[PDB]
Amino acid sequence: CSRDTYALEQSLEFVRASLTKVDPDGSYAIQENIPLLIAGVIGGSYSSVSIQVANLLRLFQIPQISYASTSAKLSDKSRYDYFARTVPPDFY
Amino acid sequence: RREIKIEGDLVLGGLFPINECGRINEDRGIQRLEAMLFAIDEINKDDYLLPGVKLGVHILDTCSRDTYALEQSLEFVRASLTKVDPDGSYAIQENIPLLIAGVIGGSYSSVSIQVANLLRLFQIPQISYASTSAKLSDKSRYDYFARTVPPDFYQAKAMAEILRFFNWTYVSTVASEGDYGETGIEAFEQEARLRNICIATAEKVGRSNIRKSYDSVIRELLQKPNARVVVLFMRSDDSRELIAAASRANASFTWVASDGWGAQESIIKGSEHVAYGAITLELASQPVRQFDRYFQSLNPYNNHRNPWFRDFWEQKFQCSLQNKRNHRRVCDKHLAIDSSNYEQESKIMFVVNAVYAMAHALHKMQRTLCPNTTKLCDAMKILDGKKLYKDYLLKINFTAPFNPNKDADSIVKFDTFGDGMGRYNVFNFQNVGGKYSYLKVGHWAETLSLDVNSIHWSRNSVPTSQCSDPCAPNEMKNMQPGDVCCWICIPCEPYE
Ligand SMILES: *[C@@H]1O[C@H](CO)[C@@H](O[C@@H]2O[C@H](CO)[C@@H](O)[C@H](O)[C@H]2NC(C)=O)[C@H](O)[C@H]1NC(C)=O
Helix, strand or coil: CCCHHHHHHHHHHHHCCHHHHHCCCCCCCCCCCCCCCCCCEECCCCHHHHHHHHHHHCCCCCCEEECCCCCHHHCCCCCCCCEEECCCCCCC | CCCEECCCCEEEEEEECCECCCCECHHHHHHHHHHHHHHHHHHHHCCCCCCCCCEEEEEEECCCCHHHHHHHHHHHHCCHHHHHCCCCCCCCCCCCCCCEEEEEECCCHHHHHHHHHHHCCCCCCEEECCCCCHHHCCCCCCCCEEECCCCHHHHHHHHHHHHHHCCCCEEEEEEECCCHHHHHHHHHHHHHHHCCCEEEEEEEECCCCCHHHHHHHHHHHHCCCCCCEEEEECCHHHHHHHHHHHHHCCCCCEECCCCCCCCCHHHHHHCCCCCCCCEEEEECCCCCHHHHHHHHCCCCCCCCCCCCHHHHHHHHHCCECCCCCCCCCECCCCCCCCCCCCCCCCCHHHHHHHHHHHHHHHHHHHHHHCCCCCCCCHHHHCCCHHHHHHHHCCCCEEECCCCCCCCCCCEEECCCCCCCCCCEEEEECCECCCCECCEEEEEECCCEEECHHHCCCHHHCCCCCCCCCCCCCCCCCCCCCCCCCCCCCCCCCCCC
């Protein structure tokens, strides 16, 4: 939705798969809809969305590749050590 | 995977370095854990603040590592996603994690940084009790992290002033890798450059558990006999490792230590011969007598909440229990920790202050967001992290919980950077009556207040942490022949 908070919520939905495995006891059995373990995240349009999702995925060592985030704030690998892109940075 | 859980409407997270992870951190970690537990019990026992709502606990061991602390914070945060996630046959109960109102913990800078980066995604306020690093001062990267302790540049400039007071121009320094040691040593180097103090060697260590690097660092320190003062800036584990390495060799440096070492009994207890005039500095604080009497009465069969308490007793008293009955002796029934057994940690009151700050923020939110009642309501069912933090934590101002003096310092105030007052107590590891023990020798709030007559230097002489000569520029000059910073005298002709 071109917003940082909504993208953060969607990345939370993405990442709610590794914690499910370590978490599920109950009567009989529970199936519901088990989230799949995301091998890597492809997305991150707009710089705010990419920054938020990279900050989220740096906690779960989930690689992220962006297609349109051409901001220079994501160039450094210290804050975002699992974020990459196929587009040039912003100073160019 | 040992966890401490107490049922309650609002639960406060707990991050402590209980295990230093196979060995238990006796003085720091478990004492801080007990301080938090005692503060929460006092909060639940008095009706003046938070009368109706009960404050649960969620305490986890960080093992003094960033990855383990990250995993424990993941365990903490796996409560909001559970509610939005659970269909299944019949019903599923298991063990529903409780929604953490706020996280109280974050010893060591790396743990605090990782947990703050985790909680910034869930608007969960975090209050630290021992992370005195300057990297967390900014509110941009960490917009939900605060602390009851001053930042690191105050400590760095205090160390620089201590060096300058004794004219220790030529010093050697060893720093720890990561977020605390690196930033703190950068600030200290900047302060030394401002005050014209030349560092002989800048060494960095790591938590690789390899003594070879530590003894190599000790040998490198020995390579500069002129710099007999070591400004040691590292964590407790790294300080202990370097103390052991220097004890393996023959070193007699006067370690000007930081809050990482401070007034710690385990580091010196490893070996007391290497350290005899170490001018350490820790966060200035007053011991809590209520927590003293709470911890003195603690017994292995009395406090069943802590899964580590039995192992704490076994490690501290060296006596095993009936589980083994062959490795060691049997602990006495009259055995206790009443007196002459433990020394109060200087950051216990900081833990109490952090817990009471979180409690007072919750109480103010209840008095504002949930009026006409002192118990839980619909408004308090869901907590707004941004509002709670920004309003009732960054603008909080309350007196100290247990301080009959009620002096000016008995006020917990969060500045614009979410930090505490810059007060430091400078101790020296001197001997007064044949028994080694720390005792306060100075103070630093805005300027040094030091007692030279009660220092008792190593080798019973004032250290000379200077190069060959400061030289006289009136009739000579300097050329820096061998050292980048040190120099020598070359006489100047009358016509030059
Ligand atoms: C540290 O260096 C300063 C600068 O020399 C010393 O200050 C003066 O030292 C001379 C003797 O060297 C005294 O006659 C002066 O009275 C001192 N003036 C002041 C304002 O201190 C200082 O004594 C030195 N301190 C130590 C512990 O060596």
